[PDB]
Amino acid sequence: KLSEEQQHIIAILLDAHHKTYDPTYADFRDFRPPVRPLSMLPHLADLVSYSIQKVIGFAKMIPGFRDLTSDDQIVLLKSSAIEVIMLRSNQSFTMDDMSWDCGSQDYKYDVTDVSKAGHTLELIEPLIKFQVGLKKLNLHEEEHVLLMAICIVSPDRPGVQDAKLVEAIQDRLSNTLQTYIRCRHPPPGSHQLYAKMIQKLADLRSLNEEHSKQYRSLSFQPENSMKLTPLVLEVFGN
Amino acid sequence: NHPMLMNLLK
Ligand SMILES: C=C1[C@H](O)CC(=C/C=C2\CCC[C@]3(C)[C@@H]([C@H](C)CCC(C)(C)O)CC[C@@H]23)C[C@H]1O
Numbered sequence: 001k002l003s004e005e006q007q008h009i010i011a012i013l014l015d016a017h018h019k020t021y022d023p024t025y026a027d028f029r030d031f032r033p034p035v036r037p038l039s040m041l042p043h044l045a046d047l048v049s050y051s052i053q054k055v056i057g058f059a060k061m062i063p064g065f066r067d068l069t070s071d072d073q074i075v076l077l078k079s080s081a082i083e084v085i086m087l088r089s090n091q092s093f094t095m096d097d098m099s100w101d102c103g104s105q106d107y108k109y110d111v112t113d114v115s116k117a118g119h120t121l122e123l124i125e126p127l128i129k130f131q132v133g134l135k136k137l138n139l140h141e142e143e144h145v146l147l148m149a150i151c152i153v154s155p156d157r158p159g160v161q162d163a164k165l166v167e168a169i170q171d172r173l174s175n176t177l178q179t180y181i182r183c184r185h186p187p188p189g190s191h192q193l194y195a196k197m198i199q200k201l202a203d204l205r206s207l208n209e210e211h212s213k214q215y216r217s218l219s220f221q222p223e224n225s226m227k228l229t230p231l232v233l234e235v236f237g238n
Numbered sequence: 239n240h241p242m243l244m245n246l247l248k
Contacts, residue, residue, distance in 0.1 A: 056246045073247050074240050234242045 002183050006176045009063055013145040016061035020054040021088060025102040034106050040116035041218075041227045044109075048085065049229035055084045055152075062149045064169035072166065075159040080152045081235055082211050083204040086130065087148050093131040118218040123210045130203050137196055138189060146177040147197050151204065212236075 002010075027050060032042035059065055059077055068076070092100045099110040114124050139147070150173050155166040181193050219225040219238055 053246060056243070060247065070244065070247060074243055077243060077247075078240070231242050234240055 002176075002179055006179055009173070009176045010142050010146070010180065012061060012063055013149055014141060016058050017088075017141070017145045017148070019061075020057045021091065023091070025092075025107060028102060028107050034113075036113065036116070038116060038118050038224060038227070040109075040113045041118055041224065044113070044117040045228045045232055049231045051085045051088070052081050052231055052235050055081055055088065058084070058148065059152050062153060062169070062173075064172065065153060068165060068169075069162065072160060072162055075157055075161075076152055076154070076166070078235055079157040079159070079208070080154070083151055083201075083208050084148050086127065086204060086207055087134075087144075087151060087200075090131055090134045090144075093135060095132060095135055098128050098132070118224065119214055123207070123214055126203075126210065127207060130200070130207060133203070134200055137193065137200075139197075140180075140185065142180055142184070143177065143193075143197070146173060146180065147200065149173050150177065151201060154201075 028047070031046035031050070034040060034043040056077055059073070065073065065076075089100055092102050094101050097110070099108055101108045111124055111128070114127070115121075150170060153166055153170040153173065155163040155170060157166075160166055177197070178194050181190050185193060215236055216238075219228065219233075219236075225233065225238060
């Protein structure tokens with residue numbers, strides 16, 4: 001049974017996601033234009049930078065996240081940003097053609113697009129498998145917003161200080177998710193759903209690690225990192 | 239350190 005506290009938590013995370021994820025994608029008109037050997041770097045860099053801002057505005061609203069010091073807040077958002085971007089992007093992802101469809105042909109991103117941003121199959125293939133496996137879980141929006149929150153507030157992020165507090169916040173969220181699945185997700189969809197969602201957090205750690213390797217290699221050449229944004233440089237490095 | 243992140247965090 002969902003406590004009043006637990007229904008509260010879900011209500012706040014849902015509203016937080018609604019206030020930070022525009023499914024009309026109206027702001028995409030502001031990005032440097034897509035061009036279809038690193039011709040998608042400006043556009044995708046801008047997409048990413050915008051998406052870091054949204055993911056921060058979500059994080060702030062996670063009940064308890066604000067009780068963390070500003071230095072723990074920063075550690076959690078730097079390590080998780082690319083993972084929450086990959087998560088939250090499942091919403092525009094479509095298995096119809098293994099692409100992210102943000103509203104129009106211009107803003108429909110496939111394998112070739114990501115490779116024209118400096119990435120290789122070593123990232124892209126596992127990224128597509130992840131998106132596919134996440135879609136097949138068929139999460140309730142309540143589950144989706146809980147997983148993003150659980151992702152941000154992970155006590156194992158290198159650099160964390162008050163791990164105990166991060167863990168207590170995260171536990172409150174994990175417990176809410178486990179109880180939500182039990183009370184509101186009907187079988188068979190719910191079979192081992194919690195363990196499948198935690199698996200997706202492990203897939204994201206390995207995606208984060210490969211994304212970091214190739215980002216570092218892309219951004220080594222000052223000519224490429226000229227095309228990023230200042231927020232992207234600050235959050236992802238150099 | 240992370241002034242842009244710090245600022246978005248209020
Ligand atoms: C609002 C959103 C999300 O926040 C961002 C969405 C897309 C996410 C994607 C698909 C295209 C390629 C992206 C940007 C990936 C790409 C490897 C990032 C490239 C850089 C930052 C240059 O390394 C990360 C997440 C991917 C569209 C839409 O769902």
